[PDB]
């Protein structure tokens, strides 16, 4: 139910323009939404690879993907895809009330 990893082949990219919404937006909107305490990310690396991931924890349900990043930031966005899109949210859309 709550426990374990949920994991997705997610990569994150970078942001296409400076005003793009980002997964990590969403997710927090979404938590807003839903009354929910705010995500925590977690980074798990592997140094001797300059590699990075994140653990991003939701309504205490762990999310990660299955692929690292060579950027932090990146990691953290690919959790918060994770998260997002396996729960079928949308990851660039935020509303406008």
């Given at each position: 139910?709550?426990?374990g990893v949920i994991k997705?082949?997610?990569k994150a990219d970078r942001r296409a323009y400076p005003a793009?919404?980002?997964?990590?937006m969403c997710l927090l909107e979404w938590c807003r939404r839903e009354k929910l305490?705010?995500?925590?990310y977690e980074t798990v690396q592997r140094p001797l690879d300059?590699?990075?991931?994140?653990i991003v924890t939701v309504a205490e349900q762990k999310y990660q993907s299955t692929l690292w990043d060579k950027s932090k930031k990146l990691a953290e966005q690919a959790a918060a895809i994770v998260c997002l899109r396996?729960?079928?949210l949308?990851?660039?859309?935020?509303?406008?009330?």
């Open positions: 139910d709550t426990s997705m082949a997610v793009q919404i980002t997964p990590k305490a705010q995500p925590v300059r590699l990075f991931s994140s396996s729960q079928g949308p990851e660039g859309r935020l509303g406008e009330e």
